[PDB]
Design an enzyme around this catalytic site. Structure first.
Site, PDB file in Angstrom:
ATOM      1  NE  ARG A  45      -7.293   9.416  -1.122  1.00 41.62           N
ATOM      2  CZ  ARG A  45      -8.496   9.803  -0.713  1.00 41.62           C
ATOM      3  NH1 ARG A  45      -9.003  11.006  -0.955  1.00 41.62           N
ATOM      4  NH2 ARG A  45      -9.230   8.967  -0.029  1.00 41.62           N
ATOM      5  CG  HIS A  49      -8.458   5.913  -4.142  1.00 42.31           C
ATOM      6  ND1 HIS A  49      -9.412   6.096  -3.232  1.00 42.31           N
ATOM      7  CD2 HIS A  49      -7.266   5.832  -3.485  1.00 42.31           C
ATOM      8  CE1 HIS A  49      -8.856   6.126  -2.067  1.00 42.31           C
ATOM      9  NE2 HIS A  49      -7.571   5.968  -2.232  1.00 42.31           N
ATOM     10  CG  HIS A 172       1.043   8.067   2.028  1.00 42.90           C
ATOM     11  ND1 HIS A 172       0.636   7.037   2.758  1.00 42.90           N
ATOM     12  CD2 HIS A 172      -0.011   8.327   1.203  1.00 42.90           C
ATOM     13  CE1 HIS A 172      -0.581   6.685   2.429  1.00 42.90           C
ATOM     14  NE2 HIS A 172      -0.980   7.483   1.463  1.00 42.90           N
ATOM     15  CD1 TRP A 188       2.204  10.121   6.013  1.00 42.94           C
ATOM     16  CD2 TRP A 188       1.018  11.430   4.560  1.00 42.94           C
ATOM     17  NE1 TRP A 188       1.049   9.554   5.816  1.00 42.94           N
ATOM     18  CE2 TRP A 188       0.319  10.274   4.946  1.00 42.94           C
ATOM     19  CE3 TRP A 188       0.481  12.308   3.619  1.00 42.94           C
ATOM     20  CZ2 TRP A 188      -0.917   9.964   4.401  1.00 42.94           C
ATOM     21  CZ3 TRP A 188      -0.750  11.995   3.069  1.00 42.94           C
ATOM     22  CH2 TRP A 188      -1.438  10.852   3.451  1.00 42.94           C
TER      23      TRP A 188
HETATM   24  C1  HEM Z   1      -2.276   0.616   2.207  1.00 46.30           C
HETATM   25  C2  HEM Z   1      -2.147   1.744   1.342  1.00 46.30           C
HETATM   26  C3  HEM Z   1      -2.700   3.006   1.514  1.00 46.30           C
HETATM   27  C4  HEM Z   1      -3.573   3.497   2.474  1.00 46.30           C
HETATM   28  C5  HEM Z   1      -4.240   2.824   3.667  1.00 46.30           C
HETATM   29  C6  HEM Z   1      -3.671   4.856   2.211  1.00 46.30           C
HETATM   30  C7  HEM Z   1      -4.480   5.755   2.920  1.00 46.30           C
HETATM   31  C8  HEM Z   1      -4.604   7.145   2.738  1.00 46.30           C
HETATM   32  C9  HEM Z   1      -5.393   7.981   3.483  1.00 46.30           C
HETATM   33  C10 HEM Z   1      -6.238   7.586   4.693  1.00 46.30           C
HETATM   34  C11 HEM Z   1      -5.245   9.249   2.920  1.00 46.30           C
HETATM   35  C12 HEM Z   1      -5.895  10.553   3.344  1.00 46.30           C
HETATM   36  C13 HEM Z   1      -7.195  10.881   2.640  1.00 46.30           C
HETATM   37  C14 HEM Z   1      -7.791  12.227   3.009  1.00 46.30           C
HETATM   38  O1  HEM Z   1      -8.147  12.450   4.160  1.00 46.30           O
HETATM   39  O2  HEM Z   1      -7.924  13.113   2.164  1.00 46.30           O
HETATM   40  C15 HEM Z   1      -4.339   9.105   1.897  1.00 46.30           C
HETATM   41  C16 HEM Z   1      -3.891  10.143   1.079  1.00 46.30           C
HETATM   42  C17 HEM Z   1      -3.053  10.091  -0.032  1.00 46.30           C
HETATM   43  N1  HEM Z   1      -2.593   8.957  -0.545  1.00 46.30           N
HETATM   44 FE1  HEM Z   1      -2.651   7.095   0.392  1.00 46.30          FE
HETATM   45  N2  HEM Z   1      -2.871   5.217   1.196  1.00 46.30           N
HETATM   46  C18 HEM Z   1      -2.371   4.084   0.707  1.00 46.30           C
HETATM   47  C19 HEM Z   1      -1.625   4.020  -0.468  1.00 46.30           C
HETATM   48  C20 HEM Z   1      -1.302   5.028  -1.390  1.00 46.30           C
HETATM   49  C21 HEM Z   1      -0.638   4.803  -2.604  1.00 46.30           C
HETATM   50  C22 HEM Z   1      -0.205   3.426  -3.154  1.00 46.30           C
HETATM   51  C23 HEM Z   1      -0.632   6.058  -3.215  1.00 46.30           C
HETATM   52  C24 HEM Z   1      -0.138   6.474  -4.467  1.00 46.30           C
HETATM   53  C25 HEM Z   1       0.791   5.776  -5.354  1.00 46.30           C
HETATM   54  C26 HEM Z   1      -1.180   6.945  -2.285  1.00 46.30           C
HETATM   55  C27 HEM Z   1      -1.252   8.340  -2.434  1.00 46.30           C
HETATM   56  C28 HEM Z   1      -1.866   9.279  -1.608  1.00 46.30           C
HETATM   57  C29 HEM Z   1      -1.759  10.645  -1.745  1.00 46.30           C
HETATM   58  C30 HEM Z   1      -0.840  11.395  -2.719  1.00 46.30           C
HETATM   59  C31 HEM Z   1      -2.566  11.170  -0.742  1.00 46.30           C
HETATM   60  C32 HEM Z   1      -2.812  12.650  -0.451  1.00 46.30           C
HETATM   61  C33 HEM Z   1      -4.123  13.203  -1.058  1.00 46.30           C
HETATM   62  C34 HEM Z   1      -4.420  14.630  -0.656  1.00 46.30           C
HETATM   63  O3  HEM Z   1      -3.505  15.356  -0.263  1.00 46.30           O
HETATM   64  O4  HEM Z   1      -5.560  15.032  -0.719  1.00 46.30           O
HETATM   65  N3  HEM Z   1      -1.638   6.316  -1.210  1.00 46.30           N
HETATM   66  N4  HEM Z   1      -3.944   7.827   1.782  1.00 46.30           N
END
Ligand code: HEM
Length: 291
Positions: A45, A49, A172, A188
């Site tokens: 993540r 970002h 995700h 997820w």
């Molecule tokens: C429209 C696109 C995206 C949105 C709105 C989105 C939104 C989010 C949100 C709301 C979280 C949770 C944050 C938290 O509470 O800790 C999250 C987690 C995460 N996202 Fe996304 N995401 C998007 C795209 C992506 C992409 C493109 C990647 C990576 C190539 C990604 C990888 C991750 C990962 C691995 C987590 C988990 C982090 C953790 O476990 O702490 N996301 N995302």
């Protein structure tokens, strides 16, 4: 803006393989983070970002300048929770002080995926730290409460097409949302620190119910204890995204090949590579090295 990649002086493949090995050995050791999910999900993540602020129109933002190190980007509301991945990588940067920030932040993402049994991601070195006034303003990273047209339009700014967006969203399958970070709660899927096509199988196979959560946000919840964000659920509401979701649900190797191409492009956006520059490096896992 032009951002030319410049190799850290005198460093070759073997040097970067030692920074990869250090991040991977520490992923192995600090396995207890976030109820034993480990730091692999918050590190991929973080790499997304620091890369996702790029704007193709003026070449601002992106992974090059390592500007997340600055207060304005570090304290962005959309980056809440990433301070855990930053604190993980900080002893590694004291051990290898020569690597630039953008190169460490993006290599953390690569190391995490490969160590979580994901595909090999080719990585290029050469990001250069830029000054604090090149830090992008907050608000360039995407909202979760939106639909498939928002998603398509957003990813166009990073010039990702439909196939790249669905492949990238498949990350995700890792980790979870946390109520205190984002206003959403839940994982997820079930194998959330092993990289597989599980996000797509859950999206096509669960009985999803729309509900408000404790932060007053809507999310899709399933009997199994899993969740999907509005932007994730969008991928089966759009006809073009849905044929790609089904393709990845039936073929994990196609998902790994496309995720690999798109994640490297996302980490390299905004960077010009001279052809005197080294080819992209393929790092060995700890396992391939007997370590
Ligand atoms: C429209 C696109 C995206 C949105 C709105 C989105 C939104 C989010 C949100 C709301 C979280 C949770 C944050 C938290 O509470 O800790 C999250 C987690 C995460 N996202 Fe996304 N995401 C998007 C795209 C992506 C992409 C493109 C990647 C990576 C190539 C990604 C990888 C991750 C990962 C691995 C987590 C988990 C982090 C953790 O476990 O702490 N996301 N995302």
């Amino acid at each position: 803006l032009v951002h030319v990649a410049s190799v850290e002086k005198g460093r070759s493949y073997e040097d970067f393989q030692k920074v990869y090995n250090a991040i991977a050995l520490k992923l192995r050791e600090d396995d207890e983070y976030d109820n034993y999910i480990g730091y692999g999900p918050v590190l991929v993540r973080l790499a997304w970002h620091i890369s996702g602020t790029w704007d193709k129109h003026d070449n601002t933002g992106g992974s090059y300048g390592g500007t997340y190190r600055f207060k304005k980007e570090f304290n962005d509301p959309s980056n809440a929770g990433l301070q855990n991945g930053f604190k993980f990588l900080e002893p590694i940067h004291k051990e290898f002080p020569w690597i630039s920030s953008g190169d460490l932040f993006s290599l953390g993402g690569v190391t995490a995926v490969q160590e979580m049994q994901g595909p090999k991601i080719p990585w290029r070195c050469g990001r250069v730290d830029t000054p604090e006034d090149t830090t992008p303003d907050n608000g360039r990273l995407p909202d979760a409460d939106k639909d498939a047209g928002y998603v398509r339009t957003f990813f166009q700014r990073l010039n990702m097409n439909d196939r790249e967006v669905v492949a990238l969203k498949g990350a995700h399958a890792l980790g979870k949302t946390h109520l205190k970070n984002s206003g959403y709660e839940g994982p997820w899927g079930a194998a959330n620190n092993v990289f597989t096509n599980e996000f797509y199988l859950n999206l096509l196979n669960e009985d999803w119910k729309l509900e408000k959560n404790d932060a007053n946000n809507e999310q899709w919840d399933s009997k199994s204890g899993y969740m999907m964000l509005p932007t994730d659920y969008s991928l089966i509401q759009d006809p073009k995204y849905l044929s790609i979701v089904k393709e990845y649900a039936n073929d994990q190797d196609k998902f790994f090949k496309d995720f690999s191409k798109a994640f490297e492009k996302l980490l390299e956006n905004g960077i010009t590579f001279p052809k005197d520059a080294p080819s992209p490096f393929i790092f060995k896992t700890l396992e391939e090295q007997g370590l």
